């Protein structure tokens, strides 16, 4: 079914964001794992899988709407060198992605692509859950101190 | 444990190949799915998951050897427009990757990084399995004709 | 128990036929497998196992009758280069073997080696089953055409 | 995938060794069985099946590498007339095969056929297990005497 | 159904052989048991049951063919006084019985009593199995020595 | 099977390393246990069992190759007096052992003892896993502080 | 809890005996295994595990009593070259160890270290069981002869 060209461009742009998050969250995960921060590896890896699911949804949607998914262009990764920097970087990435999502959702509505909108709203809901987790972790680092925070990561939950 | 710098560069180069295959196989898969070629979507998607597993192994190994995994640089995808072109493109990608693997395996041996070698040999074994499948499919297209070939893809196995 | 010398020679000759069929059917099987003709690999391989069972029966019988099983001499294999040629070659091999079996069965009867005869009749029954399958497949190639025939081989049954 | 021609020749040569062992171990097995040496029939027969598995691996590998498996040429069998001679003959056969394997493994490495090498190393590992068993049995014959050795073979284990 | 008179006479003669074997094998069995040769008692007793089954088949067949089964005349038993003599005596008895069976099978064929023939061939097959076991045991006595042979009989298998 | 003399010497040298690790890891384990550091006792003890498995492999291999395993000479233990010193000492021991392994693996290859090589590569893979764990623990001590690190050891996982 | 210094020295001396037995029994076990003497490998290996358990008890006890377990000094192994010599050597080792145990048990009593005594009495009980087994085996060698003795070892029990 021929979709609206601009919806397709938004979908490719969102896909682009997901491709960046997939890689950044995957590397961050295995960095945590290497450091023995098991709990962080589990969450971060499952966050990477989640973005893969999102990418898959965009790819299928783009294809259905008869556009060309773009997996060739990869935006800037921002890989941190310590736990806090890594988490802040993920947070900034999510915030930028939410921004793009809000714009796309608004536009899809005004061209009546309600199923693209509906798919994007579920994704935004998942992203806000991830933003919440990131914000909470960053606050915990500050409230309990880094040493205690790190110790709390060495065993998986539960 | 500080690894050999050049082994790390090889590992990053191989990781690079996997990142390309992950994306190319994933797009190809969902293209097949869109076309209703269920059997091809299943194999191609599972081939994409397989390259993700390979990437994961390289990432962990690089990290253990104390290098920096590079997930920022993404080589050229070659996305085909019909089934045969897609499969040929995957085949050429695998052949180039096997070439790189053989070189890395040789070099790891001569610096005594036997566990990197051992990991790379398992990966090469998986790739040759994939090359075999690709070669066989391409020959089937020719032997049974495209119409029959396509019909044979519309139901998953078994 | 000292058997009739000539029965032993027949048994060794039949064993000879089985040794040829074992190898020819095994190679043919893995050729089909390589080509992705799964259904043909299954039947052909199980036909190879069957001839191994026959060889085993001859070997034990020869030994019981106090002769020397000959596994040293291997007759001519006729390995085909395409599906039809392979199947025709197996068919001609079975037909020649049935011929030898009929002679041996007749002779065993006239020297009263009724248990050798009885064993050979079961084997002839298995061979005629195999001849029937071969004849039927060859006719299918012709009736449905090679392209359809090949497509019908790519998935195992059932 | 077009393999190295010389690797293919080695593979055919090793296949040749397996074809000889398959037959020799099978006859030896049923000789032991005829003599009521149940334990020896079980081991020897399972050693024959093992060489069949090896042959199968060579055949598939040769085919994948696009060469012609040779099952037509059968080397010299050396069938013994008593238990010790049979076992010594198997031992000499294994030792010659290990020799050929070592050469092939070395050569495959230098042309970078690492998966052929890897397959051949698993096979060599199985052969050395068989050599160990043979050497041990032959020593037992000598240590306990032939009469005791034979008595120890009449019931299967365990 | 009125059978051929001469087939009936053969059947009565074979029945005669079975009656002798039943008794001889039964006595031999309980002699072995008395001597504590458990393994030999088990085989010999089950050989006695087997000949009873054969007798039963002849009796039913004779009756069906409307003749008179003769259980009144009992041929010569040859009871041995030591293990080897007992086994040799059983062997000679089986060999004489096989001789009679071969003649009867030939004759039944020429008068078209194919079901009598078919029954006699199954019996001959059982007898040749028994001959094989006897021949093997006698050879074991010689190969391992009597003392070892006897020791190997004192526990049942398995 | 007579092995290469120098391979045997390497195997005895590696065995020597294992004997030292077995004892050092065992004492370190029960020191941790005494201190109530349950988690460390579990890992360290299981690391001791692991080196026992390695020793067993060398012993069997040496014996098969017809050499004399040397369990008489015991190298220097380096037993630490606090957690960090103990772990650093294990780490230095593993690093020295990896060094010896790499040399032996290289040499086994050049004399074609591919199964000794293959066994040694599996062992090196286990050692690198242990090195990774040690490096990670030592970094955790530093990142979370000793007090937090110790507290994290008092309950077993999970 | 600060233990008596001399009890600690005894405990270290007994530990020393266990370290020797661990190694000697382990090598002897795998020698038996190499020779195909399965039954002897099982008992001897389980005897080695048993001495490891004893060593573990001494190590924990020494640590609890606040001494330094000594795993650095390894007494003389006496590795035999044939079955009888190996068993005699183990027997002499056990006898010397029982001697040391009796002295230590007496002394622990007179300084009121009743729990060290109680632990040592359980160990002495295990050693006397092992002495009994050794004495019995050595007598069997003599009573049945070496050839019969060896044959009785080739299958595990039961
Ligand atoms: C960039 C585009 C990618 C897409 C569209 C994608 C898609 C997917 C999907 C749909 C799954 C199944 C979810 C699940 O396992 O439950 C998956 C699994 C997985 N992915 Fe990705 N992926 C991508 C890239 C990557 C990369 C770069 C890595 C890094 C190594 C990776 C690592 C993994 C791993 C380890 C699994 C689990 C394997 C399994 O157990 O099945 N993926 N991916
Ligand atoms: C010469 C090339 C041969 C090849 C490549 C080959 C291959 C095989 C394979 C792959 C199996 C199945 C293994 C398993 O899963 O257990 C098998 C089974 C068997 N083979 Fe062969 N074989 C060969 C020759 C022979 C010969 C000459 C004999 C002698 C009679 C023989 C006797 C048997 C028997 C009795 C079985 C088991 C049948 C059953 O009960 O399933 N084979 N063979
Ligand atoms: C030095 C040469 C040694 C060798 C070759 C050796 C070998 C082995 C092997 C193969 C196992 C069984 C592994 C498994 O299947 O889990 C084992 C278990 C064990 N070892 Fe050792 N060992 C040695 C020394 C020691 C020492 C010095 C100690 C210290 C006390 C020790 C303590 C133990 C313990 C406690 C077990 C487990 C017992 C059980 O619960 O079954 N070992 N050993």
Swiss-Prot record, chains A, B, C, D, E, F, G:
Changing residue 86 to L: No loss of heme binding. Its cofactor is heme b; Fe cation. Its EC number is 1.16.3.1. Heme b binds at residue 52. GO terms for cellular component: cytosol; membrane. Keywords: Heme, Iron, Iron storage, Metal-binding, Oxidoreductase. Changing residue 18 to A: Highly decreased Fe(2+) oxidation activity. Is also severely restricted in its ability to lay down an iron core. One of its GO terms (biological process) is iron ion transport. InterPro entries: Bacterioferritin, Ferritin-like, Ferritin-like_diiron, Ferritin-like_SF, Ferritin_DPS_dom. Residues 1-145 form the Ferritin-like diiron domain. Changing residue 100 to D: In strain: ECOR 30. Changing residue 127 to Q: Decreased Fe(2+) oxidation activity. Is also affected in its ability to lay down an iron core. Fe cation 2 binds at residues 51, 94, 127, 130. It catalyses: 4 Fe(2+) + O2 + 4 H(+) = 4 Fe(3+) + 2 H2O; Fe(2+)(in) = Fe(2+)(out). Fe cation 1 binds at residues 18, 51, 54, 127. It comes from the Bacteria. Binds 1 heme b (iron(II)-protoporphyrin IX) group per dimer. One of its GO terms (molecular function) is ferric iron binding. Fe cation 3 binds at residues 46, 50. SUPFAM superfamilies: Ferritin-like. Iron oxidation is inhibited by Zn(2+), which binds at the ferroxidase center with a higher affinity that Fe(2+). The occupation of the ferroxidase center by Zn(2+) also severely restricts the ability of BFR to form an iron core. Belongs to the bacterioferritin family. Homooligomer of 24 subunits, arranged as 12 dimers, that are packed together to form an approximately spherical molecule with a central cavity, in which large amounts of iron can be deposited as a ferric-oxy-hydroxide mineral core. This is Bacterioferritin. It comes from Escherichia coli (strain K12).
């Amino acid at each position: 079914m021929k979709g609206d060209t601009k919806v397709i461009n938004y979908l490719n742009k969102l896909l682009g964001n997901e491709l960046v998050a997939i890689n950044q969250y995957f590397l961050h995960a295995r960095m945590f794992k290497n450091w023995g921060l098991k709990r962080l590896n589990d969450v971060e890896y499952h966050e990477s899988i989640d973005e893969m699911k999102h990418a898959d949804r965009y790819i299928e949607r783009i294809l259905f709407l008869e556009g060309l998914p773009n997996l060739q262009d990869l935006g800037k990764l921002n890989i941190g060198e310590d736990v806090e920097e890594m988490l802040r970087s993920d947070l900034a990435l999510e915030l930028d992605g939410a921004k793009n999502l809000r714009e796309a959702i608004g536009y899809a509505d005004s061209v009546h692509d309600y199923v693209s909108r509906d798919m994007m709203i579920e994704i935004l809901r998942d992203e806000e859950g991830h933003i919440d987790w990131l914000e909470t972790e960053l606050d915990l680092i500050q409230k309990m101190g880094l040493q205690n925070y790190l110790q709390a990561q060495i065993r998986e939950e539960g």
